[PDB]
Protein backbone atom coordinates (compact mmCIF):
# COMPACT_ATOMS: atom_id res chain seq x y z
CA UNK A 1 0.00 0.00 0.00
CA UNK A 2 3.01 2.24 0.48
CA UNK A 3 4.82 3.31 -2.67
CA UNK A 4 7.83 5.57 -3.15
CA UNK A 5 9.18 7.43 -6.18
CA UNK A 6 12.61 8.85 -6.91
CA UNK A 7 12.65 12.57 -6.12
CA UNK A 8 15.61 13.42 -8.36
CA UNK A 9 15.49 17.04 -9.55
CA UNK A 10 11.72 17.31 -9.29
CA UNK A 11 10.81 20.71 -7.89
CA UNK A 12 7.34 19.41 -6.88
CA UNK A 13 8.67 16.48 -4.94
CA UNK A 14 11.29 18.72 -3.25
CA UNK A 15 8.73 21.40 -2.43
CA UNK A 16 6.45 18.86 -0.76
CA UNK A 17 9.32 16.97 0.90
CA UNK A 18 10.90 20.06 2.45
CA UNK A 19 7.74 21.95 3.50
CA UNK A 20 6.80 18.80 5.37
CA UNK A 21 10.23 18.30 6.97
CA UNK A 22 10.16 21.94 8.08
CA UNK A 23 6.63 21.72 9.49
CA UNK A 24 7.18 18.35 11.17
CA UNK A 25 10.70 19.00 12.56
CA UNK A 26 12.27 16.19 10.52
CA UNK A 27 15.77 17.71 10.59
CA UNK A 28 18.32 16.15 12.88
CA UNK A 29 21.67 17.37 14.28
CA UNK A 30 24.90 15.85 13.04
CA UNK A 31 28.31 16.94 14.36
CA UNK A 32 31.96 17.11 13.33
CA UNK A 33 34.78 17.72 15.82
CA UNK A 34 36.82 20.89 15.28
CA UNK A 35 40.17 20.32 16.83
CA UNK A 36 43.56 21.93 17.71
CA UNK A 37 46.24 21.56 14.99
CA UNK A 38 48.90 21.38 17.70
CA UNK A 39 47.15 18.66 19.67
CA UNK A 40 44.24 16.94 17.95
CA UNK A 41 43.03 15.40 21.21
CA UNK A 42 42.07 18.92 22.22
CA UNK A 43 38.57 19.83 21.00
CA UNK A 44 37.73 23.46 20.23
CA UNK A 45 34.07 22.89 19.32
CA UNK A 46 31.65 20.68 17.39
CA UNK A 47 30.34 22.04 14.14
CA UNK A 48 26.58 21.37 13.80
CA UNK A 49 25.53 19.97 10.44
CA UNK A 50 21.89 19.69 9.35
CA UNK A 51 20.57 16.27 8.36
CA UNK A 52 17.22 15.51 6.81
CA UNK A 53 16.10 12.00 7.77
CA UNK A 54 13.25 11.39 5.28
CA UNK A 55 10.35 8.94 5.77
CA UNK A 56 12.02 6.22 3.69
CA UNK A 57 14.74 6.28 6.35
CA UNK A 58 17.54 7.85 4.31
CA UNK A 59 19.62 10.78 5.61
CA UNK A 60 20.13 13.77 3.28
CA UNK A 61 23.09 16.17 3.64
CA UNK A 62 22.71 19.96 3.90
CA UNK A 63 24.77 20.23 0.73
CA UNK A 64 21.91 18.46 -1.04
CA UNK A 65 18.85 20.30 0.30
CA UNK A 66 20.05 23.85 1.06
CA UNK A 67 19.93 24.87 -2.60
CA UNK A 68 16.24 23.85 -2.68
CA UNK A 69 15.47 25.58 0.60
CA UNK A 70 16.99 28.64 -1.08
CA UNK A 71 14.97 28.23 -4.26
CA UNK A 72 11.76 28.15 -2.22
CA UNK A 73 12.80 30.94 0.15
CA UNK A 74 12.75 28.77 3.27
CA UNK A 75 16.36 29.04 4.48
CA UNK A 76 15.17 31.36 7.26
CA UNK A 77 12.72 28.69 8.42
CA UNK A 78 15.60 26.24 8.61
CA UNK A 79 17.76 28.53 10.80
CA UNK A 80 14.93 29.17 13.23
CA UNK A 81 14.42 25.41 13.52
CA UNK A 82 18.12 24.51 13.63
CA UNK A 83 18.88 27.23 16.20
CA UNK A 84 16.11 26.23 18.59
CA UNK A 85 17.02 22.56 18.36
CA UNK A 86 20.68 23.33 18.99
CA UNK A 87 19.96 25.53 22.03
CA UNK A 88 17.83 22.71 23.40
CA UNK A 89 20.41 19.95 22.95
CA UNK A 90 23.18 22.05 24.57
CA UNK A 91 21.30 21.81 27.86
CA UNK A 92 22.49 18.21 28.00
CA UNK A 93 26.25 18.78 27.99
CA UNK A 94 29.14 21.23 28.33
CA UNK A 95 30.69 21.19 24.84
CA UNK A 96 30.96 24.21 22.59
CA UNK A 97 29.14 24.28 19.25
CA UNK A 98 29.16 26.26 16.03
CA UNK A 99 26.11 26.78 13.81
CA UNK A 100 25.62 28.54 10.48
CA UNK A 101 23.25 31.40 9.69
CA UNK A 102 22.11 32.02 6.13
CA UNK A 103 21.89 35.35 4.33
CA UNK A 104 18.11 34.97 4.08
CA UNK A 105 18.00 35.30 7.86
CA UNK A 106 20.51 38.18 8.03
CA UNK A 107 18.82 40.19 5.28
CA UNK A 108 15.25 39.88 6.63
CA UNK A 109 15.43 42.15 9.72
CA UNK A 110 12.35 40.54 11.26
CA UNK A 111 13.90 37.06 11.04
CA UNK A 112 17.17 38.49 12.31
CA UNK A 113 15.32 39.90 15.29
CA UNK A 114 13.65 36.60 16.01
CA UNK A 115 17.13 35.06 16.17
CA UNK A 116 18.20 37.69 18.73
CA UNK A 117 15.03 37.08 20.74
CA UNK A 118 15.82 33.39 20.90
CA UNK A 119 19.43 34.08 21.84
CA UNK A 120 18.33 36.52 24.54
CA UNK A 121 16.26 33.63 25.92
CA UNK A 122 19.40 31.53 26.47
CA UNK A 123 22.05 34.01 27.55
CA UNK A 124 23.44 31.22 29.71
CA UNK A 125 24.70 29.34 26.65
CA UNK A 126 26.37 32.38 25.11
CA UNK A 127 29.93 31.26 25.82
CA UNK A 128 29.23 27.84 24.30
CA UNK A 129 27.78 28.76 20.89
CA UNK A 130 29.41 30.44 17.85
CA UNK A 131 27.43 31.51 14.76
CA UNK A 132 29.13 31.17 11.37
CA UNK A 133 28.59 32.71 7.95
CA UNK A 134 30.09 31.23 4.83
CA UNK A 135 32.12 33.66 2.75
CA UNK A 136 29.52 33.05 -0.07
CA UNK A 137 26.82 34.92 1.78
CA UNK A 138 28.52 37.66 3.77
CA UNK A 139 26.21 40.68 4.23
CA UNK A 140 27.53 44.26 3.84
CA UNK A 141 30.20 45.66 6.21
CA UNK A 142 27.65 47.51 8.37
CA UNK A 143 25.48 44.40 8.82
CA UNK A 144 28.52 42.39 9.81
CA UNK A 145 29.35 45.13 12.32
CA UNK A 146 25.90 45.32 13.84
CA UNK A 147 25.55 41.52 13.91
CA UNK A 148 28.83 41.05 15.76
CA UNK A 149 28.00 43.83 18.26
CA UNK A 150 24.55 42.42 19.11
CA UNK A 151 25.96 38.90 19.49
CA UNK A 152 28.85 40.11 21.67
CA UNK A 153 26.27 42.01 23.74
CA UNK A 154 24.15 38.86 24.17
CA UNK A 155 27.31 36.95 25.09
CA UNK A 156 27.62 34.90 21.92
CA UNK A 157 30.46 34.77 19.40
CA UNK A 158 30.63 35.08 15.59
CA UNK A 159 32.92 33.53 12.94
CA UNK A 160 33.32 33.36 9.15
CA UNK A 161 33.95 30.15 7.19
CA UNK A 162 35.07 29.04 3.72
CA UNK A 163 37.26 32.14 3.87
CA UNK A 164 40.02 32.87 1.36
CA UNK A 165 38.74 34.38 -1.89
CA UNK A 166 37.91 37.57 -0.03
CA UNK A 167 41.30 38.03 1.67
CA UNK A 168 40.91 41.66 0.35
CA UNK A 169 38.71 42.40 3.33
CA UNK A 170 41.06 41.03 5.98
CA UNK A 171 41.61 44.62 7.16
CA UNK A 172 37.82 45.07 7.38
CA UNK A 173 37.73 42.27 9.96
CA UNK A 174 40.02 44.03 12.48
CA UNK A 175 37.28 45.26 14.81
CA UNK A 176 34.67 42.52 14.43
CA UNK A 177 36.05 40.40 17.23
CA UNK A 178 35.44 37.18 15.29
CA UNK A 179 36.11 34.02 17.34
CA UNK A 180 38.05 32.51 14.43
CA UNK A 181 38.28 32.27 10.62
CA UNK A 182 37.69 28.97 8.83
CA UNK A 183 39.82 28.61 5.70
CA UNK A 184 38.27 26.93 2.65
CA UNK A 185 39.57 23.38 2.15
CA UNK A 186 40.73 24.16 -1.38
CA UNK A 187 43.60 26.31 -0.06
CA UNK A 188 45.05 23.44 2.05
CA UNK A 189 44.14 20.49 -0.25
CA UNK A 190 47.21 18.24 -0.71
CA UNK A 191 49.38 21.10 0.54
CA UNK A 192 52.17 18.72 1.64
CA UNK A 193 52.29 17.69 -2.01
CA UNK A 194 51.75 21.16 -3.54
CA UNK A 195 54.04 23.54 -1.83
CA UNK A 196 53.12 26.54 -4.01
CA UNK A 197 49.95 26.67 -1.87
CA UNK A 198 51.95 27.50 1.26
CA UNK A 199 52.82 31.14 0.55
CA UNK A 200 49.16 32.19 0.52
CA UNK A 201 48.48 30.34 3.81
CA UNK A 202 51.57 31.97 5.30
CA UNK A 203 50.17 35.38 4.29
CA UNK A 204 46.76 34.75 5.83
CA UNK A 205 48.10 33.35 9.07
CA UNK A 206 50.48 36.30 9.50
CA UNK A 207 47.85 38.96 8.69
CA UNK A 208 45.14 37.22 10.76
CA UNK A 209 47.52 36.84 13.64
CA UNK A 210 48.34 40.59 13.65
CA UNK A 211 44.64 41.23 14.30
CA UNK A 212 44.24 38.45 16.94
CA UNK A 213 42.15 36.18 14.74
CA UNK A 214 42.84 32.42 15.03
CA UNK A 215 42.86 30.44 11.76
CA UNK A 216 41.13 27.00 11.42
CA UNK A 217 41.58 24.87 8.29
CA UNK A 218 38.50 23.17 6.80
CA UNK A 219 38.05 19.78 5.16
CA UNK A 220 41.40 18.31 6.18
CA UNK A 221 41.61 14.78 4.81
CA UNK A 222 45.19 13.69 5.20
CA UNK A 223 48.00 13.31 7.80
CA UNK A 224 50.16 15.20 5.29
CA UNK A 225 47.90 18.26 5.06
CA UNK A 226 47.56 18.23 8.84
CA UNK A 227 51.35 18.18 9.34
CA UNK A 228 51.80 21.30 7.21
CA UNK A 229 48.87 23.16 8.77
CA UNK A 230 50.45 22.43 12.17
CA UNK A 231 53.96 23.32 11.07
CA UNK A 232 52.77 26.69 9.67
CA UNK A 233 51.18 27.62 12.99
CA UNK A 234 47.42 27.53 12.32
CA UNK A 235 45.22 27.15 15.36
CA UNK A 236 42.63 24.57 14.34
CA UNK A 237 41.65 21.86 11.89
CA UNK A 238 38.51 20.00 10.87
CA UNK A 239 37.65 17.36 8.28
CA UNK A 240 37.14 13.73 7.30
CA UNK A 241 40.46 12.77 8.93
CA UNK A 242 38.80 13.05 12.34
CA UNK A 243 35.71 11.17 11.22
CA UNK A 244 32.53 11.58 9.22
CA UNK A 245 29.60 13.73 10.34
CA UNK A 246 27.74 11.69 12.98
CA UNK A 247 24.96 12.17 15.58
CA UNK A 248 25.80 13.32 19.11
CA UNK A 249 28.38 11.60 21.36
CA UNK B 1 30.31 65.78 -49.52
CA UNK B 2 31.74 64.21 -46.39
CA UNK B 3 29.23 63.04 -43.81
CA UNK B 4 29.74 61.31 -40.47
CA UNK B 5 27.40 59.30 -38.25
CA UNK B 6 27.60 58.42 -34.56
CA UNK B 7 29.03 54.93 -34.16
CA UNK B 8 27.58 54.31 -30.69
CA UNK B 9 27.06 50.60 -30.02
CA UNK B 10 26.65 49.69 -33.68
CA UNK B 11 28.44 46.42 -34.36
CA UNK B 12 28.54 47.21 -38.12
CA UNK B 13 30.13 50.59 -37.67
CA UNK B 14 32.65 49.13 -35.18
CA UNK B 15 33.46 46.18 -37.43
CA UNK B 16 34.18 48.49 -40.37
CA UNK B 17 35.98 51.08 -38.23
CA UNK B 18 38.33 48.58 -36.59
CA UNK B 19 39.09 46.33 -39.58
CA UNK B 20 40.16 49.50 -41.36
CA UNK B 21 42.25 50.84 -38.46
CA UNK B 22 43.96 47.45 -38.23
CA UNK B 23 44.62 47.23 -41.98
CA UNK B 24 45.74 50.85 -42.29
CA UNK B 25 47.86 51.06 -39.10
CA UNK B 26 45.68 53.78 -37.55
CA UNK B 27 46.68 52.94 -33.98
CA UNK B 28 49.09 55.25 -32.23
CA UNK B 29 51.28 54.87 -29.11
CA UNK B 30 50.42 56.75 -25.95
CA UNK B 31 52.53 56.50 -22.78
CA UNK B 32 52.24 56.84 -19.02
CA UNK B 33 55.29 57.12 -16.73
CA UNK B 34 55.72 54.32 -14.18
CA UNK B 35 57.74 55.70 -11.36
CA UNK B 36 59.52 54.88 -8.04
CA UNK B 37 57.32 55.32 -4.93
CA UNK B 38 60.40 56.37 -2.97
CA UNK B 39 61.49 58.99 -5.48
CA UNK B 40 58.98 59.89 -8.17
CA UNK B 41 61.62 61.65 -10.27
CA UNK B 42 63.05 58.20 -10.89
CA UNK B 43 61.38 56.51 -13.87
CA UNK B 44 61.13 52.71 -13.99
CA UNK B 45 59.46 52.47 -17.41
CA UNK B 46 56.75 53.90 -19.66
CA UNK B 47 53.61 51.87 -20.03
CA UNK B 48 52.46 51.80 -23.68
CA UNK B 49 48.77 52.48 -24.18
CA UNK B 50 46.98 51.94 -27.50
CA UNK B 51 45.17 54.87 -29.07
CA UNK B 52 42.90 54.79 -32.08
CA UNK B 53 42.99 58.14 -33.89
CA UNK B 54 39.94 57.85 -36.20
CA UNK B 55 39.43 59.79 -39.45
CA UNK B 56 37.24 62.43 -37.79
CA UNK B 57 40.33 63.25 -35.73
CA UNK B 58 39.17 61.93 -32.35
CA UNK B 59 41.34 59.65 -30.20
CA UNK B 60 39.73 56.49 -28.77
CA UNK B 61 41.06 54.74 -25.64
CA UNK B 62 41.93 51.02 -25.51
CA UNK B 63 39.30 50.66 -22.80
CA UNK B 64 36.73 51.61 -25.44
CA UNK B 65 37.78 49.47 -28.41
CA UNK B 66 39.38 46.34 -26.90
CA UNK B 67 36.01 44.80 -26.07
CA UNK B 68 35.06 45.11 -29.77
CA UNK B 69 38.39 43.77 -30.97
CA UNK B 70 37.60 40.82 -28.69
CA UNK B 71 34.09 40.39 -30.02
CA UNK B 72 35.44 40.19 -33.57
CA UNK B 73 38.42 38.00 -32.67
CA UNK B 74 41.04 40.56 -33.70
CA UNK B 75 42.93 41.13 -30.43
CA UNK B 76 45.81 39.07 -31.84
CA UNK B 77 45.99 41.40 -34.85
CA UNK B 78 46.27 44.33 -32.46
CA UNK B 79 49.20 42.80 -30.51
CA UNK B 80 51.13 42.03 -33.67
CA UNK B 81 50.64 45.64 -34.78
CA UNK B 82 51.28 47.20 -31.36
CA UNK B 83 54.39 45.06 -30.78
CA UNK B 84 56.00 45.88 -34.11
CA UNK B 85 55.29 49.59 -33.72
CA UNK B 86 56.73 49.59 -30.21
CA UNK B 87 59.92 47.77 -31.23
CA UNK B 88 60.33 50.33 -34.00
CA UNK B 89 59.89 53.41 -31.82
CA UNK B 90 62.34 52.10 -29.18
CA UNK B 91 65.13 52.47 -31.73
CA UNK B 92 64.84 56.21 -31.14
CA UNK B 93 65.64 56.33 -27.43
CA UNK B 94 66.94 54.52 -24.35
CA UNK B 95 63.86 54.33 -22.11
CA UNK B 96 62.28 51.11 -20.92
CA UNK B 97 58.73 50.23 -21.96
CA UNK B 98 55.97 47.83 -20.96
CA UNK B 99 53.36 46.45 -23.35
CA UNK B 100 50.36 44.16 -22.85
CA UNK B 101 49.68 40.84 -24.55
CA UNK B 102 46.14 39.51 -24.80
CA UNK B 103 44.95 35.96 -24.13
CA UNK B 104 43.94 35.62 -27.79
CA UNK B 105 47.62 35.83 -28.66
CA UNK B 106 48.77 33.51 -25.84
CA UNK B 107 46.17 30.85 -26.60
CA UNK B 108 46.74 30.70 -30.38
CA UNK B 109 50.17 28.98 -30.54
CA UNK B 110 50.79 30.22 -34.07
CA UNK B 111 50.24 33.85 -33.04
CA UNK B 112 52.34 33.23 -29.95
CA UNK B 113 55.12 31.96 -32.17
CA UNK B 114 54.92 34.98 -34.42
CA UNK B 115 55.44 37.12 -31.32
CA UNK B 116 58.59 35.13 -30.45
CA UNK B 117 59.82 35.45 -34.02
CA UNK B 118 59.47 39.21 -33.84
CA UNK B 119 61.18 39.32 -30.45
CA UNK B 120 64.02 37.15 -31.74
CA UNK B 121 64.43 39.78 -34.46
CA UNK B 122 65.18 42.48 -31.85
CA UNK B 123 67.17 40.70 -29.16
CA UNK B 124 69.01 43.98 -28.69
CA UNK B 125 65.95 45.59 -27.09
CA UNK B 126 65.32 42.70 -24.70
CA UNK B 127 66.48 44.54 -21.58
CA UNK B 128 64.26 47.52 -22.43
CA UNK B 129 60.86 45.86 -22.96
CA UNK B 130 58.53 44.08 -20.49
CA UNK B 131 55.37 42.22 -21.58
CA UNK B 132 52.36 42.36 -19.26
CA UNK B 133 49.23 40.27 -18.83
CA UNK B 134 46.23 41.52 -16.92
CA UNK B 135 45.03 39.22 -14.16
CA UNK B 136 41.72 38.93 -16.16
CA UNK B 137 43.33 36.90 -18.89
CA UNK B 138 46.07 34.83 -17.28
CA UNK B 139 46.62 31.54 -19.16
CA UNK B 140 47.14 28.25 -17.28
CA UNK B 141 50.18 27.71 -15.00
CA UNK B 142 52.12 25.76 -17.66
CA UNK B 143 51.59 28.47 -20.31
CA UNK B 144 52.76 31.12 -17.88
CA UNK B 145 55.83 28.96 -17.22
CA UNK B 146 56.68 28.39 -20.85
CA UNK B 147 56.00 32.03 -21.75
CA UNK B 148 58.32 33.34 -19.06
CA UNK B 149 61.07 30.85 -19.98
CA UNK B 150 61.00 31.74 -23.70
CA UNK B 151 61.00 35.47 -22.94
CA UNK B 152 63.86 35.13 -20.44
CA UNK B 153 65.72 33.12 -23.10
CA UNK B 154 65.16 35.86 -25.70
CA UNK B 155 66.31 38.43 -23.12
CA UNK B 156 62.93 40.01 -22.44
CA UNK B 157 61.00 40.28 -19.18
CA UNK B 158 57.42 39.45 -18.16
CA UNK B 159 55.00 40.98 -15.60
CA UNK B 160 51.39 40.67 -14.42
CA UNK B 161 49.04 43.61 -13.87
CA UNK B 162 45.70 44.38 -12.21
CA UNK B 163 46.81 41.78 -9.66
CA UNK B 164 45.04 41.20 -6.36
CA UNK B 165 41.93 39.04 -6.67
CA UNK B 166 44.14 36.05 -7.40
CA UNK B 167 46.50 36.46 -4.43
CA UNK B 168 45.81 32.67 -3.99
CA UNK B 169 48.41 31.99 -6.65
CA UNK B 170 51.16 34.13 -5.15
CA UNK B 171 53.04 30.91 -4.34
CA UNK B 172 52.63 29.82 -7.98
CA UNK B 173 54.60 32.91 -9.03
CA UNK B 174 57.78 31.98 -7.11
CA UNK B 175 59.74 30.63 -10.07
CA UNK B 176 58.39 32.77 -12.91
CA UNK B 177 60.97 35.49 -12.49
CA UNK B 178 58.41 38.24 -13.13
CA UNK B 179 59.94 41.73 -13.39
CA UNK B 180 57.22 43.12 -11.12
CA UNK B 181 53.54 42.83 -10.11
CA UNK B 182 51.11 45.68 -10.78
CA UNK B 183 48.42 45.95 -8.10
CA UNK B 184 44.88 46.86 -9.19
CA UNK B 185 44.01 50.48 -8.34
CA UNK B 186 40.95 49.41 -6.36
CA UNK B 187 43.15 48.02 -3.55
CA UNK B 188 44.94 51.38 -3.03
CA UNK B 189 42.02 53.76 -3.84
CA UNK B 190 41.74 56.42 -1.11
CA UNK B 191 43.87 54.22 1.13
CA UNK B 192 45.03 57.20 3.25
CA UNK B 193 41.34 57.69 4.00
CA UNK B 194 40.39 53.99 4.31
CA UNK B 195 42.90 52.34 6.51
CA UNK B 196 41.16 48.94 6.52
CA UNK B 197 42.65 48.55 3.02
CA UNK B 198 46.20 48.56 4.40
CA UNK B 199 46.33 45.08 5.93
CA UNK B 200 45.80 43.39 2.55
CA UNK B 201 48.52 45.55 0.92
CA UNK B 202 50.84 44.74 3.82
CA UNK B 203 50.22 41.02 3.19
CA UNK B 204 50.95 41.24 -0.53
CA UNK B 205 54.08 43.32 -0.14
CA UNK B 206 55.47 40.95 2.50
CA UNK B 207 54.67 37.77 0.53
CA UNK B 208 55.85 39.27 -2.79
CA UNK B 209 59.01 40.50 -1.16
CA UNK B 210 59.85 37.00 0.18
CA UNK B 211 59.90 35.80 -3.45
CA UNK B 212 61.88 38.83 -4.80
CA UNK B 213 58.95 40.33 -6.69
CA UNK B 214 58.68 44.16 -6.63
CA UNK B 215 55.17 45.61 -6.20
CA UNK B 216 53.90 48.59 -8.30
CA UNK B 217 50.58 50.28 -7.51
CA UNK B 218 48.25 51.16 -10.41
CA UNK B 219 45.97 54.14 -10.98
CA UNK B 220 47.32 56.32 -8.19
CA UNK B 221 45.41 59.60 -8.20
CA UNK B 222 46.26 61.36 -4.99
CA UNK B 223 49.22 62.61 -2.89
CA UNK B 224 47.55 60.80 0.01
CA UNK B 225 47.45 57.38 -1.68
CA UNK B 226 51.03 57.90 -2.82
CA UNK B 227 52.21 58.70 0.72
CA UNK B 228 50.81 55.44 2.07
CA UNK B 229 52.10 53.33 -0.82
CA UNK B 230 55.54 54.82 -0.12
CA UNK B 231 55.30 54.43 3.63
CA UNK B 232 54.33 50.73 3.27
CA UNK B 233 57.41 50.03 1.16
CA UNK B 234 56.04 49.33 -2.33
CA UNK B 235 58.50 49.76 -5.17
CA UNK B 236 56.56 51.65 -7.83
CA UNK B 237 53.53 53.76 -8.65
CA UNK B 238 51.62 54.84 -11.74
CA UNK B 239 48.48 56.88 -12.40
CA UNK B 240 46.79 60.17 -13.21
CA UNK B 241 48.80 61.94 -10.50
CA UNK B 242 51.84 61.87 -12.79
CA UNK B 243 49.84 62.99 -15.80
CA UNK B 244 47.39 61.72 -18.39
CA UNK B 245 48.31 59.27 -21.14
CA UNK B 246 50.14 61.30 -23.80
CA UNK B 247 52.22 60.72 -26.98
CA UNK B 248 55.99 60.26 -26.76
CA UNK B 249 58.34 62.73 -24.99
N1 LIG C 1 35.49 16.71 0.67
C1 LIG C 1 35.37 16.81 2.10
N2 LIG C 1 34.20 17.17 2.65
C2 LIG C 1 34.09 17.26 3.99
C3 LIG C 1 35.21 16.99 4.80
N3 LIG C 1 34.85 17.15 6.10
C4 LIG C 1 33.56 17.51 6.13
N4 LIG C 1 33.11 17.56 4.86
C5 LIG C 1 31.66 18.01 4.44
O1 LIG C 1 31.67 19.37 4.08
C6 LIG C 1 30.74 20.00 4.93
C7 LIG C 1 31.48 20.55 6.12
O2 LIG C 1 30.72 21.30 7.02
P1 LIG C 1 30.65 22.88 6.85
O3 LIG C 1 32.04 23.41 6.63
O4 LIG C 1 30.14 23.39 8.18
O5 LIG C 1 29.75 23.44 5.68
C8 LIG C 1 28.36 23.30 5.82
C9 LIG C 1 27.57 24.49 6.19
O6 LIG C 1 28.17 25.63 5.78
C10 LIG C 1 26.21 24.25 5.54
N5 LIG C 1 25.07 23.81 6.57
C11 LIG C 1 25.04 22.64 7.23
N6 LIG C 1 24.09 22.69 8.19
C12 LIG C 1 23.52 23.91 8.13
C13 LIG C 1 22.50 24.53 8.86
O7 LIG C 1 21.88 23.87 9.90
N7 LIG C 1 22.16 25.80 8.55
C14 LIG C 1 22.77 26.48 7.57
N8 LIG C 1 22.33 27.80 7.22
N9 LIG C 1 23.75 25.89 6.87
C15 LIG C 1 24.15 24.63 7.12
O8 LIG C 1 26.41 23.46 4.41
C16 LIG C 1 27.68 22.78 4.62
C17 LIG C 1 27.31 21.43 5.02
O9 LIG C 1 27.22 20.64 3.92
P2 LIG C 1 27.38 19.16 4.33
O10 LIG C 1 26.44 18.48 3.37
O11 LIG C 1 26.92 18.92 5.75
O12 LIG C 1 28.88 18.72 4.17
C18 LIG C 1 29.74 18.91 5.24
C19 LIG C 1 30.58 17.80 5.39
O13 LIG C 1 29.96 16.52 5.17
C20 LIG C 1 36.42 16.63 4.20
O14 LIG C 1 37.54 16.33 4.96
N10 LIG C 1 36.46 16.55 2.85
N1 LIG D 1 40.61 56.01 -12.94
C1 LIG D 1 41.98 56.10 -13.35
N2 LIG D 1 42.36 55.62 -14.55
C2 LIG D 1 43.66 55.71 -14.93
C3 LIG D 1 44.60 56.29 -14.06
N3 LIG D 1 45.81 56.26 -14.67
C4 LIG D 1 45.67 55.68 -15.87
N4 LIG D 1 44.36 55.37 -16.01
C5 LIG D 1 43.77 54.61 -17.26
O1 LIG D 1 43.67 53.24 -16.98
C6 LIG D 1 44.43 52.58 -17.96
C7 LIG D 1 45.82 52.35 -17.43
O2 LIG D 1 46.68 51.62 -18.24
P1 LIG D 1 46.78 50.04 -18.05
O3 LIG D 1 46.93 49.74 -16.57
O4 LIG D 1 48.07 49.65 -18.74
O5 LIG D 1 45.59 49.17 -18.58
C8 LIG D 1 45.44 49.07 -19.97
C9 LIG D 1 45.86 47.83 -20.64
O6 LIG D 1 45.78 46.76 -19.80
C10 LIG D 1 44.93 47.72 -21.85
N5 LIG D 1 45.64 48.09 -23.23
C11 LIG D 1 46.06 49.32 -23.58
N6 LIG D 1 46.81 49.24 -24.69
C12 LIG D 1 46.87 47.95 -25.06
C13 LIG D 1 47.49 47.26 -26.11
O7 LIG D 1 48.26 47.95 -27.02
N7 LIG D 1 47.36 45.92 -26.18
C14 LIG D 1 46.65 45.23 -25.28
N8 LIG D 1 46.47 43.82 -25.43
N9 LIG D 1 46.05 45.87 -24.27
C15 LIG D 1 46.14 47.21 -24.12
O8 LIG D 1 43.74 48.36 -21.53
C16 LIG D 1 44.05 49.28 -20.44
C17 LIG D 1 44.12 50.59 -21.09
O9 LIG D 1 42.91 51.17 -21.06
P2 LIG D 1 43.07 52.70 -21.21
O10 LIG D 1 41.84 53.05 -22.01
O11 LIG D 1 44.31 53.06 -21.99
O12 LIG D 1 43.11 53.37 -19.79
C18 LIG D 1 44.35 53.50 -19.16
C19 LIG D 1 44.44 54.76 -18.54
O13 LIG D 1 43.89 55.86 -19.28
C20 LIG D 1 44.18 56.77 -12.82
O14 LIG D 1 45.07 57.38 -11.94
N10 LIG D 1 42.87 56.66 -12.51
Residue numbers in the entry:
A (entry chain A), B (entry chain A): 400 to 648
From the paper:
The crystal structure of LapDEAL bound to c-di-GMP (residues 399–648; LapDEAL•c-di-GMP) was solved by molecular replacement using the EAL domain from apo-LapDdual as the search model. We obtained crystals in two independent conditions, yielding two different crystal forms (space group C2221, two molecules per asymmetric unit; and space group P6522, one molecule per asymmetric unit). While the majority of the crystal packing contacts were different, both crystal forms maintained a common dimer of EAL domains, and the resulting structures superimposed almost perfectly (rmsd of 0.6 Å over all atoms). c-di-GMP binding did not alter the overall conformation of the EAL domain observed in the apo-LapDdual structure (rmsd of 0.6 Å over all atoms), consistent with the lack of major conformational changes upon dinucleotide binding to the EAL domains of YkuI, TDB1265, and FimX. The most notable conformational change in LapDEAL upon c-di-GMP binding occurs in the switch loop. Dinucleotide binding and the absence of the S helix in the isolated EAL domain allow the loop to restructure, resulting in the switching of the conserved phenylalanine residue F566.
As c-di-GMP levels change LapD switches between two states: the dinucleotide-unbound off state that retards stable biofilm formation by facilitating the secretion of the cell surface adhesin LapA, and the c-di-GMP-bound on state that supports cell adhesion by preventing the release of LapA from the outer membrane. Binding of c-di-GMP to the LapD EAL domain is relayed to the periplasmic output domain through an inside-out signaling mechanism that utilizes a juxtamembrane HAMP domain, a relay module often found in bacterial transmembrane receptors. Here, we present three crystal structures of LapD from P. fluorescens that provide models for the c-di-GMP-unbound cytoplasmic domain lacking only the HAMP domain, a c-di-GMP-bound EAL domain dimer, and the periplasmic domain.
